Amino acid sequence: TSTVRVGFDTPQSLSPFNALALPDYQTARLSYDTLVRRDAGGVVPGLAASWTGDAAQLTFTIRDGATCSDGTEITPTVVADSLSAFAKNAGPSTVVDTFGGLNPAITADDAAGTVMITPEAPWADLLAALSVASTGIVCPAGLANLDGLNTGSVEGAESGPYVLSEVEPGVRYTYELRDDYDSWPEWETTLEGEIPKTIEYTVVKDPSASANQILSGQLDLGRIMPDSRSRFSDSQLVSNPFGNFYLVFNEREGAVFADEKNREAVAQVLDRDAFDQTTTDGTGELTDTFGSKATQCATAAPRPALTALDESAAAETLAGVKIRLLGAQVVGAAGAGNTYLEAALREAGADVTLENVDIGTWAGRVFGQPESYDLTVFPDLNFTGTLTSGISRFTGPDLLQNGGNISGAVSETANALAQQARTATTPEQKCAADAEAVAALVAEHHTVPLLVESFIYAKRDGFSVTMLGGSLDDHLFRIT
Ligand SMILES: NNC(=O)c1ccc(O)cc1
């Protein structure tokens, strides 16, 4: 057999530029190629053979024999056109995350074979950001039709190994391997087995449905909730550390969590052990910061001072307070963590409405309609492997003003600390700024850092799956 059938969530977009949720990145990974790719000890050559520079400026030398699905030579102008189109068309949040601002300098040179990126101020995260599927290269046929990229394949747009051949919206996305592609990344790791010719990315509505369809052979790979583990042999399971979870409040003037006393009361109600039990059942790990111990600066001083549980004080504060609680269904099986949080808030006398929605709908709400909810457990994908990703959700200009500040938080201290992380002379001054920024954001009740989850793949005999270098959107499927 040459086909793999993979369980996944419904995409909200098949355009790299509009990618916000994991399924969007999963599809973008098959159809488009990024300049660099994740492997152990950092980043590996992909569509760029090598690069030079630092936080203030990077120069990528593009690789030879790189082709689009029509035949266009992938040249410096093709890449710079793609990366410019990304900078202009992607969500403000993911652009400032990639470039430290909305107006990077991007300039090709077909003679030199170079693509030069000059962020409007130094941005360390730029290199790691260009490993992320959403920065995958869109060939000229794709730039001609951006509305087309959203719903599936526009002939010749693909820089990547697969073309989406059949689409059944919200059901199945059938990918076929292109015969004219040997532009694989320069992996240091050796993978056992063969690149699948077909990938059937198959929407599962539910974790129970995921498990059943591995067990009955309707699926070859698929995500399992921790409760389903015992249905499988240890050999059928591949567990990786994945999303890092933390609270995000709507802190805008007139909203209930504009008032810090209300945010503190939520912190006083959220038992982090109980939240971990409901969400991961002990397959995950608690974290006081925006990442795991593998995250750059995540062990540097200072550690945040978390608000202690105080259910009595919280009951006085939240009596009849109206809370629009938005929940992603990845936060525990069918959003069980969001259910726990609603119940802890209701127990404190709050008038809580929970909307538990699929990851695609959740992402559209958080990034498109920020004023439409009060509180969410944010399941972050820390692509860049730094604390910067998380700090950006709470600092700088509001998302409403084309910034990355999802919450609309105004922390003077954290804003200034985000600025000194950028001016930092050394890695150590950078970690001290990042660490102090997280401590400040926790001390002022802008967030509660919760946990790092485990992504558990359950698989059938003859199928492997690998995640290299702590990567999140680069699931390496193989037939064995
Ligand atoms: N935006 N966040 C996501 O798309 C996401 C999806 C699944 C996770 O297990 C974690 C994060």
Architecture blueprint of SSEs:
Blueprint: E1 3-8, H1 22-31, E2 36-39, E3 42-45, E4 48-54, E5 57-62, H2 76-89, H3 92-99, E6 105-109, E7 114-118, H4 126-129, H5 140-143, H6 146-151, E8 162-168, E9 172-177, E10 198-203, H7 207-215, E11 221-224, E12 237-249, H8 260-267, H9 272-280, E13 285-286, H10 311-318, E14 322-328, H11 336-347, E15 351-357, H12 359-368, E16 375-380, H13 388-392, H14 412-422, H15 427-443, E17 449-459, E18 463-466, E19 476-479
Parallel strand pairs: 1-10, 14-15, 14-16
Antiparallel strand pairs: 2-3, 4-5, 5-7, 6-7, 8-9, 9-10, 11-17, 12-16, 12-17, 13-17, 18-19
Helix pairs in contact: 8-10, 9-11, 14-15
This protein binds 4-oxidanylbenzohydrazide.
Short description:
The chain has 480 residues and is of the alpha+beta class.
Structure, explained:
This protein has helices at residues 22-31, 76-89, 92-99, 126-129, 140-143, 146-151, 207-215, 260-267, 272-280, 311-318, 336-347, 359-368, 388-392, 412-422, 427-443, and strands at 3-8, 36-39, 42-45, 48-54, 57-62, 105-109, 114-118, 162-168, 172-177, 198-203, 221-224, 237-249, 285-286, 322-328, 351-357, 375-380, 449-459, 463-466, 476-479. A hairpin with a 3-residue loop joins strand 8 (162-168) and strand 9 (172-177). 51% of the residues are buried. The protein has 15 helices and 19 strands. The chain is of the alpha+beta class and 480 residues long. The chain is 28% helix and 24% strand. It folds into two domains: 1-242 and 455-480, no CATH class; 243-454, no CATH class. The protein starts with a strand and ends with a strand. The strands form five sheets. Strands 11, 12, 13, 14, 15, 16 and 17 form a seven-stranded mixed beta sheet that branches. Bound molecules: 4-oxidanylbenzohydrazide. 4-oxidanylbenzohydrazide (HDH) binds at residues 21-22, 242-243, 330, 359, 363, 379, 381, 453, 455.
